[PDB]
Amino acid sequence: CNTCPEAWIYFQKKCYYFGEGAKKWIQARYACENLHGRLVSIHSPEEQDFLTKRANWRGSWIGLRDLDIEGEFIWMDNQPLDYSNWQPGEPNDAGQGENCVMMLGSGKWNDAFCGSELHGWVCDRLATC
């Protein structure tokens, strides 16, 4: 089962959409839902390596946030916080609050202000048969 919609990229049972264009986090969430996916959830280094390669180098939203309880991050797929790739020193909840996670150009994660307008965002889906 390895089929993906047009413009999506297949990798290991999932499909990925590398959206481009300035969006707030909540905007990327709803954009992924509009394309029948969710902001990407990352659960292994192999998935991260795949994502880092094709990712927008100016940063991109991923599906990780601590809106519900400060300091407790949750993926869109509701699976555990098992694989992590935090940039050293992150998360730091800097500024007046950072509750949404982005990938840096290095693939390392940084929590950011949810109202920041990042230029990339990644959705995922399940591949079908």
Ligand X SMILES: CC(=O)N[C@H]1[C@H](O[C@@H]2[C@@H](OC[C@H]3O[C@H](O)[C@@H](O)[C@@H](O[C@H]4O[C@H](CO)[C@@H](O)[C@H](O)[C@@H]4O[C@@H]4O[C@H](CO)[C@@H](O)[C@H](O)[C@H]4NC(C)=O)[C@@H]3O)O[C@H](CO)[C@@H](O)[C@@H]2O)O[C@H](CO)[C@@H](O)[C@@H]1O
Examine residue 22 and tell whether it contacts ligand X (CB under 6 A). no
Distance of alpha carbon 57 from alpha carbon 120, whole angstroms: 8
Please pick, from the candidates 99, 100, 103, 127, the single residue that binds Ca ion as defined by CB under 5 A.
99
| Assigned token pair, 59 | 């940063």
| Residues 64-123 within binding reach of ligand X (CB under 6 A) | 90, 92, 94, 98, 104, 110, 112-113, 116
Q: Which does 116 bind (CB under 5 to 8 A by kind): Ca ion, ligand X, none?
A: ligand X
Q: Dihedral through CA 49, CA 112, CA 17, CA 128, nearest 10?
A: 80
Tell me how many degrees the CA angle 4-8-10 measures, rounded to the nearest 5. Answer: 60
Structure tokens at 64: 């990780």
Shortest Å distance, C-beta 94 to ligand X: 4
Residue 15 or 112 with smaller CB distance to ligand X? 112
| Residue 39 and residue 76 in contact, taking contact as beta carbons nearer than 8 Å | yes
Measured from the CB atom, the residue of 98 and 124 that comes closer to ligand X is: 98
DSSP for residue 79:
-
Interface residues toward ligand X, by CB under 6 A: 59, 90, 92, 94, 98, 104, 110, 112-113, 116
Interface residues toward Ca ion, by CB under 5 A: 66, 90, 92-94, 98-99, 110-111
